[PDB]
Assembly symmetry: C2
Homo-oligomer: 479 residues x 2
């Protein structure tokens, strides 16, 4: 029975009061990473360490400084420990991780010719990231102090520094790090200031295992190590690094969907959509308000298809989920999509293209169900879960257009229409071909697409992390 | 005695009239690539094929459709054949090679989030590039039709398509291709439309030898081949590709300077510069009007150094050589540098920083001589010859700040202050450290820097191309 210590940027807890008693209740959201790890066979117990990020989290951390045991179905439980960071330090780290800085680095946002220009803001942000990393590492070790053989699972890019700090005090422990975003080519990674570009690698490499959603991101990480650490040796075949007596294994562990979040339900469309869409084939683009989601280019590609004819009774819905609209890149992305939709309507006719904004999961699934064509054309994406979710719930045999730069394309690309997300002509040709295809062709393609998507569950991805780490840990011990 | 057939985008010929006779004269510029190849030992004869690009070139091509023998010193000669392309096709290809398209691809100009979006303009440009490539290939083969064992040397990015067309008709011939610009990481190269990104590789690979100024660019090329051509096998050690029965060798052949273009002379400063600079240490930044030259960030780094103190009697000259100012990226670069210089002067005091514009080589060398600190901080550069030229002519022991992303850094970086060109703080710290250094430290560093720079001549680089090709050709024949 492994004693598991999970760390992530957030443990999503719902705070409320009981409908009968009025008593405050605090309960873990179902489908959390910690929830799933707790159900696996070889797990004796589990703790979840994460940041306090709301006035309710701060209060729960201050009242239970060593963490709260929370119940789960089937009599299981998880000890949840939340960290109160220094508010200015935390706020500064949150800024550092947005498109203002590190989000642009891993997600390919800089032109090099005009951006970026690192100033003193970059140095202070890196200093705040070191303080934040120590906070986590202190908390994690403190939580596992009584444990003879703790197993460390570290999640999210914000925690890339933690493994070195863990390994410092726990030399023989299994430590997995999972990174949910892309890793950029070596020439791109090195845009970053020298202390950051080497400093993040030094934080990551002491892990037993480092996981990414795709092989490309593993390859790019390895190239960055070779380029920046003259001391290190990589092996592109075995997906390993040897550096300063640390051996590290790189693994690809794809993730598709949570069977819970779709489950069994039939939900309604957002207000006005069903009526607006009636009598028309519907192309749907869906994603958060982040420039990588690429809706601007999807609408321009739609207009180019339409100029070729055949789209007279076809409409397009751009579903956008508002997120971090305070980041100038994000507000600029909404502004640019708005401009394209306006220009599209003025050319092809009023109400051909509509934006619909919310963060309601139910509305998103209903839009995946209504769709006659689905477009997931991100400029880059660590994986993109929507590309597994939508075809799994759509019963219209909708084809899918998938960008070759999403981590999902490594698994689904052969079953979708794969495109270069920067090429409007190729994307327009793909939309027209998909709308011209027969009902039988689409039906047979959708069945194959679903069979390819179905195995990649949340529970399977967790099992892969534990299995992979156990094997890597045995290898690291024997070498 | 090899029969050499050189192809390049331009053979620089001077058209004028004789001061006594009034007779028209046309003569090859000294230091041309063709001039140097003609002086090498194992060369029986040479032809130079290139585009007509002036009303004078068109006239000379139409009058001598099979080319003109031009004399060179020591009784040698070169047959110069100029191609008249279709004017609209040529103009369209010239556009395609600028920052409007392919210059941005090899020189890292796109942010991915907002640019680029390839439309039908991109397809028509690729079609015009195919027509232009056939023109060259037709001309080259026609010129060498009577030659039993022709040796092909192909220069410049505009000619990357030619080798496949040559190899088609000349299976056993030695063919070298040299590319004078960077090759981008595989993820970046693939931004390009599928027909272009694979189509350029198919054009290049049939060469016997492919040369770049730096190892990094060879590595990046190889990664692009692996990523895009499933059929091909690369060997990162031997720097080879095997594809469809073609074996190709990749080589790094650095270039520093032409001893001719500096030679022996003492030239004057541009008007007003000597007087303005007197009584001040002078930091000089110099380069063409191209966003990769990075002057904006050099001026901002200068201001950041100055805020640290010690720069009270230090001034900065930004020498800019006007080039392709009609390309919006280039005019935008001048505009951005102007804005920085204006802001710098308003902060530190009137006339602290000055822009000086011209294309006079004599002025450039004099500015290299006057300099107390030299900055060559390009965002990327295929090599950057100025970083060899300036320290070789400077007699002030000026230190050099060199960007780690110039191809020159592979040869000179250990002898210069190497920086990340996106980091203003590191660059400011480098400028202050360089101005604070003692006269003895600077003197000893400049002597080592010159000794490292001196061997890399134009004639040596030519010899390396011929030697490398002869060895690769023997290897390709035996395999």
């Amino acid at each position: 029975g492994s004693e598991i210590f999970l760390a992530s940027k957030r443990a999503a807890i719902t705070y409320d009061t009981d409908p009968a008693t009025g008593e405050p209740r605090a309960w873990l959201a179902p489908g959390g990473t910690g929830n799933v790890v707790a159900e696996q066979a070889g797990v004796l117990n589990i703790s979840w360490i994460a940041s306090a990020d709301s006035e309710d989290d701060r209060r729960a951390s201050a009242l239970n400084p060593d963490g709260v045991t929370m119940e789960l179905h089937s009599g299981r439980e998880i000890l949840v420990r939340l960290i109160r960071h220094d508010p200015a330090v935390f706020r500064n780290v949150q800024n550092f991780m947005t498109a203002n800085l590190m989000w642009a680095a891993n997600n390919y946002g800089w032109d090099r010719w005009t951006q970026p220009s690192f100033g003193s803001d970059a140095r202070e942000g890196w200093a705040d990231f070191g303080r934040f990393t120590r906070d986590f590492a202190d908390a994690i070790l403190k939580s596992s102090a009584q444990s003879a053989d703790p197993v460390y699972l570290v999640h999210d890019y914000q925690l890339v520094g933690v493994p070195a700090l863990l390994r410092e005090q726990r030399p023989d422990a299994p430590i997995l790090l999972f990174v949910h975003i892309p890793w950029p080519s070596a020439d791109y990674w090195r845009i970053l200031p020298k202390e950051i570009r080497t400093g993040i690698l030094h934080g990551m490499l002491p892990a037993t295992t480092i996981g990414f959603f795709a092989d490309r991101w593993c390859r790019n990480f390895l190239e960055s190590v070779a380029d920046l650490l003259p001391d290190a040796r990589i092996d592109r075949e075995a997906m390993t690094v040897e550096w300063r007596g640390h051996r590290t294994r790189l693994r690809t562990m794809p993730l598709g969907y949570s069977p819970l979040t779709l489950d069994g339900r039939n939900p309604q469309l957002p207000e006005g959509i069903e009526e607006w869409a009636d009598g028309h084939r519907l192309v749907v683009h869906s994603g958060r308000t982040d420039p990588i989601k690429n809706a601007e280019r999807a609408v321009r590609a739609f207009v180019l298809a339409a100029r070729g004819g055949g789209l007279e009774k076809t409409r397009m819905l751009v579903r956008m989920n508002p997120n971090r609209l305070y980041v100038p890149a994000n507000a600029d992305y909404v502004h640019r999509v708005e401009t394209a939709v306006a220009e599209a309507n003025a050319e092809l006719g009023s109400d051909t293209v509509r934006i619909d904004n919310d963060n309601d999961v139910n509305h998103t699934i209903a839009c995946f169900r209504r769709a006659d064509l689905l477009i997931f054309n991100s400029t880059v994406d660590g994986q993109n879960l929507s590309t597994f979710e939508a075809p799994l719930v759509n019963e219209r045999d909708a084809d899918v257009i998938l960008s070759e730069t999403c981590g999902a394309a490594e698994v689904l690309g052969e079953y979708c229409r794969s495109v270069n997300p920067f090429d409007l002509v190729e994307q327009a040709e793909a939309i027209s071909a998909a709308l011209a295809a027969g009902p039988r062709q689409r039906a047979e393609a959708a069945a194959r697409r679903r069979d390819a998507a179905r195995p990649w569950t949340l529970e399977a991805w967790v099992q892969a992390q534990l299995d992979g780490l156990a094997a890597d840990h045995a290898a690291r011990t024997a070498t």
